[PDB]
Design a protein around this ligand. Structure first.
Ligand SMILES: O=P(O)(O)OC[C@H]1O[C@](O)(COP(=O)(O)O)[C@@H](O)[C@@H]1O
Ligand SMILES: O=P(O)(O)OC[C@H]1O[C@](O)(COP(=O)(O)O)[C@@H](O)[C@@H]1O
Ligand SMILES: O=P(O)(O)OC[C@H]1O[C@](O)(COP(=O)(O)O)[C@@H](O)[C@@H]1O
Ligand SMILES: O=P(O)(O)OC[C@H]1O[C@](O)(COP(=O)(O)O)[C@@H](O)[C@@H]1O
Lengths: 277, 277, 277, 277
């Protein structure tokens, strides 16, 4: 029952992102939150003396920071996503980058504990906020996702709007010809929560195109790219159905794309259902 | 930014249940938990000088308490159910009672905040644990569930095992002939979490009979009856598909039953799909 | 084990002071603090849209706030005072007011619990910070100090520098001619902590003139006046040895005065030792 | 803002003592406490399967534990000592040992943070309770006390009852013939708090014999011996005025002794004032 604590440009920027995430967590323990969480990030990011361009889910246009505070990196984030979360990728022209230029990204999930999944390009680490210390404690290094899972995760209430491939794929999960058990279904309906289950327990998560939202719903710059980056770094795949999420070339900051991600073999089975349609 | 706090046999028993729930919450903030949470309840219930018979999800046989500590009430509970929870109904012969003899019941959900839904027969109150005070704060009196919702909630991965009625019902939710929007689907896969969403946001939750578990999975005495009691007290319905959960006559302490509950009109539409099969 | 919470220009200003005190408490749970605590107050006070002039223990000159945010009240404070604290009185010409013009004042003591003693002119209330809620909970209304105590409190290590009256008075406390027990001595050496013991348990507290500091040490505007106001509102006295602290006319913002306060009969015995010298 | 945590018979016993201290801390954050804290220690010590004999400040007679749980060590403790604390020394015949047979001892101080000073014979470590983790974090290894300080600490309100040596010594602190500054005086009046200041900042602390309590007040087995052990391990001295505290041979479990401890040169100056009287 005794412990020692040890510490573990870009670096200051992530400190401030983590600090904002600390702030956000406590406000949640208690729509007025969107505004509040948004301003926490921006300000804490602005005053980390290390950003030039910011993209928020909450702001129509990108937020260019004052030259005195200006820095090198660009940050696209969703300040606030039942367990909700925060999403960010560190990279206006300078904000429309393809996901494969990400230097750092992560998310936070605000449950009983505040967890942060984080990667700077050499894997994924999981942190648990220690609110007494006001510091993030490493709980798992280099998290790897299962090659294949036994869970599938989408809003099946959109069945009537599904494209052929999604319909075929869900059919296979429920009626495996093979004579393997059907997958279990889980869908919390908060993307950080569903993605995070997928990372940790394995399987696949889907918010694809459908009749209602033919480009999908989830946002490229600060939802899909970020979790795509985390998932790939964890040994998984993230696709739109036609190309890896991280390879999309953004043509607007608030652009939407389809998101399919998870265990690589599960995503690869989904892609087989696409080629064949 | 200034507040005053005010207070708000059976009564001591619920105090101790709440205290055990306090204890359990903190252990969770951190399988070894099942054993630990179980023993917390039992002991705190035993030493409330007010129980005679206990039924735990964790113990094969009922736990008869020593005469010096013995009391009037009987407690059936699930110490530990991603947001997990604790479930209990206050009522061995004396433990096999039909749900309609419940004097008190509730659950706890351990998320960012520990919430307790509680009823003693005159409605449902929602409490939020204040871990600084070690006390439960009332956040909503007499919670009522929507007459009808727009959410349905089950493991659709069991489709291949569904009975005709469940299959028909899910079909209607996704393809409303009517020309109303399809319901949204949510399934966390933890029963306290799914039930609680259902209470608060409305709709229906299902873990019915299927080929695999023809009696269902969920346990009558300390899962289904308790949440059935909470849901009815909130203006909803809870059925097995053939009779209200609370009217089942238990023929074993660890008996399983099907559970369908939620907004009353949603449960009543499900029941229509049964009569017709 | 169940509770209900109830709420309990000038008003927004105190909210923000309390919020800054919330912020300060958490930073303490962990010299770099002086700067940090100071800036928290100023900013949170500035952006309460209700101040015009501020005086900090940390700033040589008074801090005039921008007209867009400007308001009616003036605040003199010590952001940071072993249990330390925060001190403030709500009232540059406009900052040099005699203590009897105070509209509101209080202190915070950062121990196991963060306590705030607060008065707006109709007594003293004691609050305990609930860090989960981020709100202050009333624990005692209209605190009254004992008419007479059994504790005296000063740095007796300054004996060699004491004036005649202080020496005579300490002699009486230790060798009561009367044949009453000697007072007990307590001296934490943090003024908020010593004052607060004095308020609650009774007795007297002294930091008088001496050879070293002939004007005393403690600061008029944001140490002595504030606690003088709290103590008088609690039925006590606060004197410099020649006039009530609150009646001094400040001739500089960082002016020092002698402070003697406590139970009124104890302060009145001290004053008798002065007249007679 | 990122950290890794690392771990750091006798050993299980100290775990349980620390656990009881965890429990006690939280009850304090909120006379009924004496009983509660006492029972926490005893039970957590009893069920560490490692004690045979216990001595509490709260129990007239020693508490012999049941053979099934019995173990090797004997524990003398004060469950509860404004910042209060817990004191314990690990060693009925088997309970009357001279302090120099101590295998382990420490104290806890319950302030803004719960600190534990701990020694197993190879120095003193300081720990800070992390209440989120429920674990104690090392903040300083092998704490050493100053050779000489500038603080003296006793209830000078007992002056009329002082023996010649104490009176002479206090005179020297206030009127240093030498032409060095007088010591500062601090006296919180809680022994854990006063001792702890003394360890960390340096100087001397005294609760000697006087006319009222000619054997002193503080208790040998679970107040004086424990802090004497901590202080010596930190490079200081602890004396009764005639022999080191740890060398006293107890003739009763609730025996009292005089306590003088601190920086070794300060204690040695006090002892010079004794030989000379
Ligand atoms: O349409 P659904 O199935 O309810 O999906 C909800 C999705 O929208 C979100 O709530 C976020 O919405 P936005 O894309 O507008 O930010 C995700 O958390 C989640 O995956
Ligand atoms: O079979 P599924 O869809 O995974 O359902 C899981 C169900 O089992 C539970 O996890 C509890 O299981 P038990 O009935 O064995 O206690 C519920 O929380 C949940 O509703
Ligand atoms: O000279 P002493 O006896 O050490 O007194 C210390 C005093 O100084 C303080 O620490 C604050 O000092 P300042 O007046 O400079 O702010 C008070 O808390 C305390 O009463
Ligand atoms: O007589 P004083 O000066 O008030 O001393 C109080 C002393 O008594 C204590 O409060 C504890 O008393 P006990 O010895 O009876 O346990 C110590 O913390 C403190 O040193």
């Amino acid at each position: 029952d005794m412990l020692t604590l040890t510490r573990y440009e870009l670096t200051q920027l992530l400190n401030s992102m983590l600090t904002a995430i600390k702030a956000i967590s406590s406000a949640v323990r208690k729509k007025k939150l969107d505004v509040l969480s948004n301003s926490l990030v921006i300000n804490m990011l602005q005053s980390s003396y290390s950003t030039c361009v910011l993209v928020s889910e909450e702001n129509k246009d990108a937020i260019i920071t004052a030259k005195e505070k200006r820095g090198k990196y660009v940050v696209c984030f969703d300040p606030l996503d039942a367990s909700i979360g925060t999403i960010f990728a560190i990279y206006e022209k300078d904000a429309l980058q393809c996901g494969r230029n990400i230097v750092a990204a992560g998310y936070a999930l605000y449950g009983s504990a505040t967890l942060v999944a984080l990667s700077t390009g050499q894997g994924v680490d999981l942190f648990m906020l220690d609110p007494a210390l006001g510091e993030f404690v490493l709980v798992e290094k280099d998290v790897k996702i299962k090659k294949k899972g036994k869970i599938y995760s989408l809003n099946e209430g959109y069945a009537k709007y599904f494209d052929a491939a999604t319909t075929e794929y869900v059919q296979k999960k429920k009626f495996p010809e093979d004579g393997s058990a059907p997958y279990g279904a889980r869908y919390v309906g908060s993307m950080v929560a569903d993605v995070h289950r997928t990372l940790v327990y394995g399987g696949i998560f889907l918010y694809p195109a459908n009749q209602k939202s033919p480009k999908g719903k989830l946002r490229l710059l600060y939802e899909c790219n970020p979790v795509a980056y985390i998932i790939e770094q964890a040994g998984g795949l993230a696709t739109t159905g036609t190309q890896p999420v991280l390879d999309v070339k953004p043509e607007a900051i608030h652009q939407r794309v389809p998101l399919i991600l998870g265990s690589p073999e599960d995503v690869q089975e989904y892609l087989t259902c696409v080629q064949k349609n």
